[PDB]
């Protein structure tokens, strides 16, 4: 389950607004169960 | 291997090296795990399964 994803996601929402933008830092939040395709790098043809 | 398991709780005076599974002795033949719904949600089963699943997932990614 994406428990810690949520905890990470909402921590960045709270106090890392000013900090992430200041470094031009793109952040990627991934769980194993949900976001398998981005981690395994196996998207559908689509 | 079930016998040698130990813990330490404070019992009114001091520390106590009491063992888990008081029923299990040298003359025991069976021990039974009891739940209401299922053993999967009794935390000595939850914990290893959860741990395995995550490690298993990782080793797949390591293999790839």
UniProtKB/Swiss-Prot annotation, chain A:
Modified residues (Phosphoserine): 1
Superkingdom of this protein's organism: Eukaryota
Modification note: 4'-phosphopantetheine is transferred from CoA to a specific serine of the Acyl carrier domain by the C-terminal PPT domain. This modification is essential for activity because fatty acids are bound in thioester linkage to the sulfhydryl of the prosthetic group.
Miscellaneous section: Present with 17000 molecules/cell in log phase SD medium.
The protein's role, per its UniProt record: Fatty acid synthetase catalyzes the formation of long-chain fatty acids from acetyl-CoA, malonyl-CoA and NADPH. The alpha subunit contains domains for: acyl carrier protein, 3-oxoacyl-[acyl-carrier-protein] reductase, and 3-oxoacyl-[acyl-carrier-protein] synthase. This subunit coordinates the binding of the six beta subunits to the enzyme complex.
Subunit (UniProt): [Alpha(6)beta(6)] hexamers of two multifunctional subunits (alpha and beta).
Family: Belongs to the thiolase-like superfamily. Fungal fatty acid synthetase subunit alpha family.
This protein's name: Fatty acid synthase subunit alpha
Gene: FAS2
Residues shown, of full length: 50 to 95 of 1887
UniProtKB/Swiss-Prot annotation, chain B:
Quaternary structure note: [Alpha(6)beta(6)] hexamers of two multifunctional subunits (alpha and beta).
Misc remark: Present with 91800 molecules/cell in log phase SD medium.
UniProt record similarity statement: Belongs to the fungal fatty acid synthetase subunit beta family.
Its job: Fatty acid synthetase catalyzes the formation of long-chain fatty acids from acetyl-CoA, malonyl-CoA and NADPH. The beta subunit contains domains for: [acyl-carrier-protein] acetyltransferase and malonyltransferase, S-acyl fatty acid synthase thioesterase, enoyl-[acyl-carrier-protein] reductase, and 3-hydroxypalmitoyl-[acyl-carrier-protein] dehydratase.
Protein name: Fatty acid synthase subunit beta
Organism encoding this protein: Saccharomyces cerevisiae (strain ATCC 204508 / S288c) (Baker's yeast)
Gene that encodes it: FAS1
